[PDB]
C-alpha cells in the first residue's frame, strides 16, 4: 500500500543482520522492505522543506535609466566634469569628441565628453543560502496487510531534521520501526542557493551564482540599494564622433531562464520552500516490528474477487478480495499454485500474511504477490470454495536479472557511493567497492564533470576512437573511461 | 509570452489517448505525455496512462520586422563652398535656400 | 535596428506572418512554453520570461 503503482519502486528484500537494513530514499520512487518474519513496509520520501533562509547578493535583471547629462571641454583644457560624477548612483562614461572652431572653441584637437545617467532597478532576483541545519525531510510510510484498495495505525509520518536525525514510526499493533537517517550527508546543500526571480524558484549551484555579469547588491536591502557595477546593463554608444547616447538592455529575464539549465525547480509557501527532488539515506532498525496476524484461525467462509487481479509494472499482482462470513479477526489463506491436483506453493507472496481485521458482514482486503513466470493460479480459500484466478507472467529470469543490472546502473549513475549503500546490510566486498568507487568518482569529477550531454558525448566518442586505435594498455584505460562517460550520458 | 487557464485530461493504461476539447483551438498550447495510473487514481490497471495539458497563449508585445526595397530610399547630400564665409557658418544649417 | 536577412528568419520565437488582422495566430507556441512533468504523476506549464 502506497507503493503499488509508483512504477519506480524497488524491493529491498533481505535482512541478514536480523536488524537494521540500509536504504537510500529518493523523491522519484519508494522502497518496499520485506523481511523474513516481519510485515512488508513501504517507505517514501515526500517533500524537503527549507526554512528561514538568508538573503545573499540579489542581482538586478532589469534596469531603468533617468536624467542623462553631459559636458565637454575644449580640446585643450582639463577634462569634462559633471558634478554628478561623485555620486555612486550614476553611470558616467568619458570619451573623446571632435571639437573646435565650429562648436565654439578655437583649436582642433579632440575634446573630452562626459555623460552621466541615473540608475534605477526593476525586477531584481535574489539568491539565498541554505545551511545544512534548518532543512526538514518528511517521510511517509505504510504497511501491508489489512488495508483495502481504497489514528490509522497502518500509516505514519516522520519528520527528520539534522537536529533530530533518528525517529521511530509507531505502528499500532505492528510495533515501531526505528529509523536513523543522515540528513546533513544526503544532499549537498553547501553549494546550492535558493533563487527567486518573480514567483519562480530554483536551486542554483553556488558557482553559477557568482560568475554572473549583472548589477548585484549584497545581502538584504534596508532601503534603496547601491549597485556597484554600473555597466553590463547600461551601454554608452557613440555617435559619429560628435555625441554620446546611453541605452539600457531589456529585462534580461529570458537569458537567465536559458542560462538556468540543469537547475532544479522548487516552490515556496511563505517563509518555507519545498524542493521536490532530493536524495536521503536512512538505516531502518526493524527489530521492534511484529506481525499482527499470527495466532489467528484460518478464515473459512468464502471469498469473492471484487475488482479483478491486476498486474503492476514490475511483475507483481494485486488482488482485492471480499470475505462473506463473520469469523472475527482471522487469517486469509492464499497462494500461487500450478497443478491444482497437488496445491504446491510456487512463487512468493509479497504481503506478509493476509489477515482480515474487520468482521461485521463482508470485509474487503487487498494483498499482492510475486508469481512465477509461467501460467499459474491465484488460489484463495481452503476447500470446495477456493475461488481461483488464472494469471500469466511474461519474462524469464534472465530478463529480470538484466533489468536489475540496468536499474543498478542507473542508480549508480545518479548517486555513486550512496548508490553503493542502497542494499548494504554491510560486508567487506560492499565497503571495498564503496571505497574504490569513492576514489574513482572523486578523480572523475575532478577531471571530467564540467560538461552536459554534448561535450561529454563528443569527448566520449573521441576517446573511444583513440583507445580503439592506440594499441597499448591505454586502450583499456580509455575504453573504460568511455564506457563511464557514455553510460553517464545515455542514462539521461 | 503570457499563459492562462490550464486544463488536463488522463486515460487508463489501456484506453485511447487523452483529448481535451481545447486541442481544436489554435490559441492553446497542448502537450501529451504518459502518467502512472491505477487502483488509487481511479481505474483498475497499472500501466502508464496518457495525460494531455493545454494552456492559453497570449503575447503582450512582439517585435516586428519590415522589408526595404532598394527603391523608395532617399539620400540627402549637403554641400558648401569656401571663399567668403566667416567661421560662424561652419555648423549652421538654418537657411541654405538663399 | 537594421538587420540582415537569415538572422530575422533563423529566430526561435513565436511568429505571426504579416497582416495582424483579427484574432492573432502564432505558428509556434513552442519554446515560449515549457511543459515539464512532476515525478511521473503531474504536468506543469510555464512561460519563459
Amino acid at each position, epitope marked *: 500500500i502506497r507503493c503499488i503503482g509508483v512504477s519506480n519502486r524497488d524491493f529491498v528484500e533481505g535482512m541478514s543482520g536480523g536488524t537494521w537494513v540500509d536504504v537510500v530514499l529518493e523523491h522519484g520512487g519508494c522502497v518496499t522492505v520485506m523481511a523474513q518474519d516481519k510485515p512488508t513496509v513501504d517507505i517514501e520520501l515526500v517533500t524537503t522543506t527549507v526554512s528561514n533562509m538568508a538573503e545573499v547578493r540579489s542581482y538586478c535583471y532589469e534596469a531603468s535609466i533617468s536624467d542623462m547629462a553631459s559636458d565637454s571641454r575644449c580640446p585643450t583644457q582639463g577634462e569634462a566634469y559633471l558634478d554628478k560624477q561623485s555620486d555612486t548612483q550614476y553611470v558616467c562614461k568619458r570619451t573623446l569628441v571632435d571639437r573646435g572652431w565650429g562648436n565654439g572653441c578655437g583649436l582642433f584637437g579632440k575634446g573630452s565628453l562626459v555623460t552621466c545617467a541615473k540608475f534605477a532597478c526593476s525586477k531584481k532576483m535574489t539568491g539565498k543560502s541554505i545551511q545544512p541545519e534548518n532543512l526538514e525531510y518528511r517521510i511517509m510510510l505504510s504497511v501491508h496487510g489489512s488495508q483495502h484498495s481504497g489514528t490509522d495505525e497502518n500509516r505514519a509520518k516522520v519528520e527528520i531534521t539534522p537536529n533530530s536525525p533518528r525517529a521511530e514510526a509507531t505502528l499500532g499493533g505492528f510495533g515501531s520501526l526505528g529509523l536513523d537517517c543522515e540528513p546533513r550527508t544526503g544532499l549537498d546543500f553547501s553549494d546550492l542557493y535558493y533563487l527567486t526571480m518573480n514567483n519562480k524558484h530554483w536551486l542554483v549551484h553556488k558557482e553559477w551564482f557568482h560568475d554572473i555579469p549583472l548589477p548585484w547588491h549584497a545581502g538584504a536591502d534596508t532601503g534603496t540599494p547601491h549597485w556597484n557595477n554600473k555597466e553590463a546593463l547600461v551601454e554608452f554608444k557613440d555617435a559619429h564622433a560628435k555625441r554620446q547616447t546611453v541605452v539600457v538592455l531589456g529585462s534580461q529575464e529570458g537569458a537567465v531562464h536559458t542560462a538556468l539549465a540543469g537547475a532544479l525547480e522548487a516552490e515556496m509557501d511563505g517563509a518555507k520552500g519545498r524542493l521536490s527532488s532530493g536524495h536521503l539515506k536512512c538505516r531502518l532498525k526493524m527489530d521492534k516490528l511484529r506481525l499482527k496476524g499470527v495466532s489467528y484461525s484460518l478464515c473459512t467462509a468464502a471469498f469473492t474477487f471484487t475488482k479483478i487481479p491486476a498486474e503492476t509494472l514490475h511483475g507483481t499482482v494485486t488482488v482485492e478480495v471480499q470475505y462473506a462470513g463473520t469469523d472475527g479477526p482471522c487469517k486469509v489463506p492464499a497462494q500461487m499454485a500450478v497443478d491444482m491436483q497437488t496445491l504446491t506453493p510456487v512463487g512468493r507472496l509479497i504481503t506478509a500474511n493476509p489477515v482480515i481485521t474487520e468482521s461485521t*458482514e463482508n470485509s*474487503k482486503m487487498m494483498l499482492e504477490l510475486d508469481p512465477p513466470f509461467g501460467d499459474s493460479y491465484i488460489v484463495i480459500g481452503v476447500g470446495e470454495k477456493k475461488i481461483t484466478h488464472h494469471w500469466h507472467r511474461s519474462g524469464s529470469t534472465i530478463g529480470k536479472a538484466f533489468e536489475a543490472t540496468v536499474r543498478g546502473a542507473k542508480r549508480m549513475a545518479v548517486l555513486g557511493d550512496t548508490a553503493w549503500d542502497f542494499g548494504s546490510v554491510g560486508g567487506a566486498l560492499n565497503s571495498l567497492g564503496k571505497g574504490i568507487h569513492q576514489i574513482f568518482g572523486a578523480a572523475f569529477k575532478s577531471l571530467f564533470g564540467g560538461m552536459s550531454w554534448f561535450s561529454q558525448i563528443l569527448i566520449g566518442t573521441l576517446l573511444m576512437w583513440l583507445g580503439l586505435n592506440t594499441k597499448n594498455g591505454s586502450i583499456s584505460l580509455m575504453c573504460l573511461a568511455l564506457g563511464g562517460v557514455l553510460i553517464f550520458l545515455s542514462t539521461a | 509570452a503570457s499563459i492562462s487557464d490550464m486544463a488536463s485530461d488522463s486515460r*487508463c493504461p489501456t484506453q485511447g489517448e487523452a483529448y481535451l476539447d481545447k486541442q481544436s483551438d489554435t490559441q492553446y498550447v497542448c502537450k501529451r505525455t504518459l502518467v502512472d495510473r491505477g487502483w488509487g*487514481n481511479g481505474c483498475g490497471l497499472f500501466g502508464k496512462g496518457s495525460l494531455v495539458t493545454c494552456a492559453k497563449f497570449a503575447c503582450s508585445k512582439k517585435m516586428t520586422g519590415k522589408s526595404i526595397q532598394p527603391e523608395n530610399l532617399e539620400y540627402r547630400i549637403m554641400l558648401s563652398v569656401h571663399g567668403s564665409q566667416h567661421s560662424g557658418m561652419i555648423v549652421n544649417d538654418t537657411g541654405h535656400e538663399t | 535596428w537594421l538587420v540582415h536577412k537569415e538572422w530575422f528568419h533563423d529566430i526561435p520565437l513565436p511568429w505571426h506572418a504579416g497582416a495582424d488582422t483579427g484574432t492573432p495566430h502564432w505558428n509556434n507556441k513552442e519554446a515560449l512554453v515549457e511543459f515539464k512533468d512532476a515525478h511521473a504523476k503531474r504536468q506543469t506549464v510555464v512561460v519563459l520570461g
Partner: antibody
Amino acid sequence: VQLVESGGGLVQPGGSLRLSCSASGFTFSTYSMHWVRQAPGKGLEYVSAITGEGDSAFYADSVKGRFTISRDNSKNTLYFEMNSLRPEDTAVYYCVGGYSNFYYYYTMDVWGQGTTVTVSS
Amino acid sequence: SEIVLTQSPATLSLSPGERATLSCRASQSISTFLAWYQHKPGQAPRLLIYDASTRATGVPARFSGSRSGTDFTLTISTLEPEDFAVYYCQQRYNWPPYTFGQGTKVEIK
C-alpha cells in the same frame, strides 16, 4: 471540517454573479473542490471542478464557456464566477471538497449547505 | 460520449420495516468506482457508500452495497423512518465528467 457557501441571489437573464465557498477545519490546499448544482425538480448535476493547487479546472458542457471556477488557498476560499446567466441555471449550488493526490479524484467528500441562484426574466 | 447512470424504478414505495433494493446501471465498465448518496429535502446530500461496498464514516451497518459487472445494488435491510429520502449513484471513474443518476425516491407505503 465545513464549507460555508454564500453569494446566491436573484438576477436577470444575462446577469453576472459570484459565489463563494469558505473552507474550514482542514488543509484547503490538499482538497480538490467541485461545484454541483440541482435544478428544482431535477437530479444533482456535477458541473465544475478544480484541483487542490489551482493548476487545472474542469467545466461541464452545460456550463463550459460562461462559468469560471477559481480558488485562493491563502484565504481558503473557492469562487465560482458565473457570467451570462440563463434561466436554466436557476438551481441550488453546493460546493464539495475531497482529499486528492491526483488532479480531481477523491473518495470521501465534504458538502456545504448550498445556496440558491434564481435567474428569472 | 460521457458515462451515464440509470436508476431503475425512480420511485420506491415501501413501509417501515421492509427491505429496500435500489439498482444503478452504468453505460460502460467501471470497476468498483461507484458511490451512493442519501439526500433529504432541506439537507445537504450525505455520502453513504464509496467504492460501491465500503460504508462511509459513521454510516450505519444496515446499508450495504454490491456490484456485478455494470450493475450496482444498494440494499437497506431494516427500513427506518429517517431512511425515507432520495438516493443517488455517482460514477467516480478516472476523470471529472463525473455524473449522478436521475435518483430514486423511497416513499412510505
